[PDB]
A and B are shown apart, each in its own frame.
With several copies, the nearest count.
Chain A
């Protein structure tokens, strides 16, 4: 349909249109009945309680998308070429992009081959030259993504301050990344946004964290997500070692945003700060909510 368009960018950069306008131009179409494709799988925890079991929290699970494609052509030789290209568009170690385009925009999922594909019918595929491949791909990161928003602030003054406009339009919290140049003393926001995961939702509403003083050449990446270490110096110096039991604890809660303040001091040659904010969604398409 023209209301929905599904594309694949392979590990090798090949572009396939599986459904929507222009589907099957590269020879591969998408078969019906694809599972765990729309909603992010979440399991909710329950613990014994007086009236049965009490809610204890939720855990998002990785996506296990089982779908099927159909590789077709008029002649078996070109069909074999198309099937080989489709297989080359996938891998186990490295991931490939699966984009969904609707009136709500374009959102992509990074997926990899969970297991070996199951191709062809019971007989040799060169007879029909039109054969289905059963794909079992997995999304380690289960959230559909749009391109993250990047903001740059460069200053020449020794001491300066800026207000980064930040807003979470998605339905799930997101973790911010900072790229800070050196030398200089940086103060970055760690606002709770009302999140009470550390019993300090109101205490940390306007929380700011001071990074250790950076020496020349010690440019840092400060990623708040739990997957990555918070502080990484580009030159390999242990910058986190001088930071005294302190961390960025709070993601950007959905529906919240403000002008977060970033302060720079003691910078003889100024400095640059880059803020990267991901746009994470649990569905391939959804109307904006607030």
Chain B
């Protein structure tokens, strides 16, 4: 076998976080189990998560993994036979620009919900007597826009705490930025400290190549004998689902066509509307794969 076939490298599996955002929520907010909308697989942020807005570009966002390790020595062996990873510490840091309430609360370890602006809008934010140990929920979601099929790759940290804050320098040519480091702790309710996830039409394309589940080879359809009504009513339209053999809905990816538009007019989303009584053929195509469904239309 030649070297290229052995390497079998795919460039499409390289994902560039073209636009990234960090969302913080109070510890009372229900943690985000996934960022994929159940109804249509879009980007769905749970309520309570609020973005920290813009942050510095050159600094970027840095994710840090620290391993505590211990070598195990054997009496009859010169090298260590095993190593134990006692713990894995996850942190992330970035340099926020905006001066909004959640950013300032995170920076000062204080709850500024009771801060009432003065008659002319001025506010004063006092640092607490003793620093307050406050935990938040973090969503670090980035988007790679490729051929109008975005890939949303995200990190979920159900419990983050301000670990350190670097010195900030005031320069008459630069805006004031706050650069905190946030350390992730394990949440008992969800059972993990950090999770990494992927979503989007691009990831739907690339999941089989990445190797999660099984490759798409068969294109099954929702029951292929639906009854629709010409007259307006409950049964004047019917929705069709196009699924793969690996339990993935490929309806957005496939192309809906109707061989007999007079009987059932098919939309892009997969809605067949009864127009004239008889039988119609609905076909959804995706590359080599094709689908077929015979729709009955009644006046």
Chain A residues in the interface with B (C-beta under 8 A): 1, 4, 6, 18-20, 23-24, 29-32, 34, 70, 72, 127-128, 130
Q: Chain A interface secondary structure, helix, strand, loop or mixed?
A: loop
Bound complex: CA A130 to CA B83 (Å): 10
- Contact-size category for B: 10 to 19
Instruction: Give residues of chain B (50-91) contacting chain A, Cβ–Cβ below 8 Å.
Output: 72-77, 81-82, 84, 86
| Chain A residue nearest to B129 in the complex (CB) | A127
Given contacts A23-B76, A24-B81, 11 further A-B contacts (CB under 8 A): A18-B75, A19-B74, A24-B74, A30-B75, A30-B76, A31-B74, A72-B72, A127-B86, A128-B84, A130-B82, A130-B84
Give every chain B residue within 8 A of A20 (Cβ-Cβ): 76
The number of inter-chain residue pairs (CB within 8 angstroms) is: 38
Task: Report the Cα distance A242→B206, complex, angstroms.
Answer: 92
Contacts of A30 in B (CB 8 A): 74-76
Distance between A202 CB and nearest chain B CB, rounded to angstroms: 44
Min Cβ gap B162→A in Å is 16
Q: Which residues 211-251 of B have a CB within 8 angstroms of A?
A: none
16 contacts between A and B (CB under 8 A): A1-B76, A6-B75, A18-B75, A19-B75, A29-B74, A30-B74, A30-B75, A30-B76, A31-B73, A31-B74, A32-B73, A70-B72, A72-B72, A127-B86, A127-B130, A128-B84
Cβ-defined contact, A4 with B76, below 8 A: yes
What are the residues of chain B within 8 A of A24 when measuring CB–CB? 74, 81
Inter-chain contacts of B74 with A (CB < 8 A): 19, 23-24, 29-32
**Chain B residues positioned under 8 Å from A4 (CB to CB):** 76
Residue with the highest number of chain A CB atoms closer than 10 Å, among B73, B75, B77? B75
CB distance from A7 to the nearest CB of B (A): 12
Residues of B close to A23: CB separation below 8 A: 74, 76
Which A residue's beta carbon lies closest to that of B76?
Answer: A19
Bound state CA distance, A281 and B133, in angstroms?
43
A72 adjacent to B82 (CB under 8 Å)? yes
> Nearest residue in B to A67 (C-beta to C-beta)?
B75
CA gap between A1 and B74 in the complex, in Å: 10
